């Protein structure tokens, strides 16, 4: 089929220590496999190019993927050029904290048509509250520097903003900052508490009541801009529009059930979702097994099967066709247990009662522009 992989080329290694981050190697309660060896990179690229049909996608995350260094990415591009025997279209993307981006990176990413996700939580004070370096110092100016480089070198990028309780209290400041910077492709990621911990216990924790307030305020700002002919693409609202018009969404977590994301750690180990890079969900190694073999594992089958359970409340919900129960990670409360109701169920219900009337209007407005914006959240065209 088409194949899409999420690769951690520096594993969980990172130069920052964001308060809410459970992905980095120096973080809460996460082993690092170091930098992906040339041999593992080559194995992975050739395998995807031989086994994919239609197209394939390589997404580089972590950890901070720029820690693998620019040479790693140059070798990636040489492998893609040499070994794409089927002449597939290849999509490449990079999610980065931005702090190591310089002119050499910006030129490389522009020249090689990468789609970049740049993590920025809002204006200076909001961003710096949680996104601190390993010495505990500020990072916002370095991220702004990366965004300016991306603008100068015409790199395609989205902003990835984590929604903490602070974000929810200050939607106006966040939305206005991104507007001033002319960042028109935004993705708001709900702050997740560490897996299987009791939810809502940290000062940054996004509780359901906070998330309701966030969604309603953000929608009002977005809709106002829409009425005034300023198009701002917000990934969730666009996913709602595409669910309304197409019956399905391009975003994992909006379609009711899980997919195998083919997360590849730097040792070549494979996992089904980036929220689940854990030994009990380790599918195998990409050096040893085909993508089909990995997908066909008992572990993958089970991971996907667990998400098909529909909560009883959802079956009767007026918004079910719109929401579909949300992302499995937001339903996974306890180790080895059946999924519960989405943590944010109440938030979605209240937001939908507030926003559904206006959502249709925009849905009736759209068309090619909506599909194109939605694609920008997924891959470089
Ligand atoms: C894990 S980072 C990896 C790439 C890179 N280091 C960066 O910051 O963009 C990927 C995205 O996940 C987000 N993230 C980190 N901790 C999170 C959490 N607890 N809940 C939701 N997203 C989180 C980050 O802010 C970032 O936007
Ligand atoms: S920069 Fe990215 S990986 Fe590193 S600590 Fe922050 S969110 Fe986590
Ligand atoms: S947990 Fe969420 S993001 Fe991961 S595969 Fe399932 S729906 Fe997708
Ligand atoms: S709003 Fe709540 S009950 Fe309705 S589909 Fe979503 S999670 Fe299920
Ligand atoms: Cl979003």
How does this model look, in words?
With 381 residues, this protein is α/β, with parallel strands linked by helices. It has 15 helices and ten strands. It has helices spanning 38-51, 70-83, 103-111, 124-130, 140-152, 165-169, 171-180, 208-227, 235-246, 291-295, 298-306, 312-315, 320-323, 345-365, 368-376, and strands at residues 3-7, 55-60, 89-96, 115-119, 156-163, 185-190, 233-234, 263-264, 269-271, 284-285. The longest helix has 21 residues, at 345-365. The two termini are 19 Å apart. The relative contact order is 0.12. Bound molecules: S-adenosylmethionine (SAM), iron/sulfur cluster (SF4) (3 copies) and chloride ion. One iron/sulfur cluster binds at residues 252-253, 258-259, 261, 273, 275, 307, 327-329.
Keywords:
monomer; 381 residues; alpha/beta; TIM Barrel; 10-stranded mixed β-sheet; 15 helices; binds iron/sulfur cluster; 4Fe4S-binding_SPASM_dom; metal-binding; iron-sulfur
CATH classification, class level: Alpha Beta
**What strand line-up does the widest sheet have?**
7-6-5-4-3-2-1-8-9-10
Order of helices and strands: EHEHEHEHHEHHEHEHEEEHHHHHH
Small molecules bound in the structure, each named once = S-adenosylmethionine, iron/sulfur cluster, chloride ion
Question: Roughly what fraction of the amino acids lie in strands?
Answer: 5-15%
* Total count of domains: 1
**Assigned CATH superfamily:** Aldolase class I
Main β-sheet description = 10 strands, mixed
Number of helices: 15
Shape: globular
CATH architecture descriptor text: Alpha-Beta Barrel
Evaluate the radius of gyration.
Answer: 20 Å
Q: How many extended strands? A: 10
How far the N terminus sits from the C terminus, by CA atoms, comes to 19 Å
Would you give the CATH topology? TIM Barrel
- By oligomeric state, this entry counts as monomer
Helix amount: 40-55%
Strand-pairing-aware structural class: alpha/beta
